[PDB]
Amino acid sequence: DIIRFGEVSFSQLAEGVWMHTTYLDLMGFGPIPSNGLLVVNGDNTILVDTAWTDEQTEQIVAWASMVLAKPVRAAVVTHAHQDKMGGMAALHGANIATWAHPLSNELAPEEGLVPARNAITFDANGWATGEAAQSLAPLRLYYPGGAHTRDNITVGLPELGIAFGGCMIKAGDASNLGNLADADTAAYAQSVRNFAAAFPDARTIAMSHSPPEGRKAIERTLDLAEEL
Amino acid sequence: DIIRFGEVSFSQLAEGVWMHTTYLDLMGFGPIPSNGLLVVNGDNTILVDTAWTDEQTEQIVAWASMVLAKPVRAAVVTHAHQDKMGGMAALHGANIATWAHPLSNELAPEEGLVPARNAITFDANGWATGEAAQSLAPLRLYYPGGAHTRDNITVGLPELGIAFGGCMIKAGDASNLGNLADADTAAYAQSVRNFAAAFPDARTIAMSHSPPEGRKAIERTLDLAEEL
Ligand SMILES: [Cl-]
Ligand SMILES: [Cl-]
Ligand SMILES: [Zn+2]
Ligand SMILES: [Zn+2]
Ligand SMILES: [Zn+2]
Ligand SMILES: [Zn+2]
């Protein structure tokens, strides 16, 4: 079931938790879907990942404030690629506090992308702490290590049993890990393992480029990551 | 009009000149087409580019020897990416002399690809000379400079008015230059210009990822390359 608003497709994964999907024909080979989340916190929403473009990101922001009546107050992006950070400028124009891994902010300019305004502090165990943890709660943010990119992070909602693997996690029937141009192939398997252990009980596994699934998406991804 | 043989699609562009198209779902976003050529030289064919895989390349080789009755005697590859060099092992297994730009041979191992057995000697003007020019005639091979990759080369057939731009050239209605992960963005425009001037009279412009077209494909590609 899907609500289509402008260029955006919204699906409810759980109460207060929506998925947004937008498309871009990145390389002329056909439109590519990209998935993020909208997480309701009281009278507002947390945005996980932008759409591909400013204009698509603006449509997400308007949907949250005008249809959900839960305007976006903070956003976190899962690494410095265009499907996850392409609309950063629209967020900053709306004066929305934005958050990323410190390495995503270093890498974004060379990628043609705008850095977030805040660095997430991750503790020595890979969990967010400090201002990021407090402001983005109930979301739990976890850095699993290098995989799809060196800066990729993951976000979880343990109470609801939902964990979002970003672009690191691929579908349970994947034949490949998608775009490895900036991947960390040596660490990929272990970082999948860390993520699986960071959210050991979540049964709903969401990811950037295919719809939500069960934990087999982790199993297939690790299998693929192990034969790199 | 298209002949489908196994996984391969063959189109005749001119007498003695065929196009081969094969598909691979490279990143899980849908199958991607890749185009090469089969050029009849007397009782044999010259192969321009492999298919995505050994198995697809073997089907091209069998088609040439068994249906065309013009077995492949030499092959040239237009740079070190999988759509152009993925089936190098099948060529060498068939004992087919293979040829590439010297930089494609240096780059191929890190890409997971097998180097060709011969380096093409390009003269100071970017045209092939020596053994490559003699053995691959009537094909004219031209190095335009860095663009889609630093090693990309182009092949022409002036008498037939056909010029093949590889992956450097994109379609007349392209919105982007496809996969720029290894591109040379500073030199891209000038190398498109060099190619356009290397084959100034060809009216049929073939390329890797869309069907043959007129010279507007050059015009649109350069326009895109100029705004990088
Ligand atoms: Cl969990
Ligand atoms: Cl010409
Ligand atoms: Zn990515
Ligand atoms: Zn992605
Ligand atoms: Zn290429
Ligand atoms: Zn290509």
From TrEMBL, chains A, B:
Record carries keyword Transmembrane: no
Main location: periplasm
Protein's UniProt keywords contain Oxidoreductase: no
Domain Metallo-beta-lactamase: 33-209
Residues engaged in binding Ca(2+) 3: D223, E226
Superkingdom assignment: Bacteria
Cofactor section: Zn(2+)
Catalytic activity: a beta-lactam + H2O = a substituted beta-amino acid
Binding site for Zn(2+) 3: D83, C167, H209
Keywords in alphabetical order: Antibiotic resistance, Calcium, Hydrolase, Metal-binding, Periplasm, Signal, Zinc
Binding, Ca(2+) 2: E131, Q134
NCBIfam families per the UniProt record, alphabetical: bla_class_B_core, bla_subclass_B1
Official protein name in the record: beta-lactamase
Species, as recorded: Erythrobacter litoralis (strain HTCC2594)
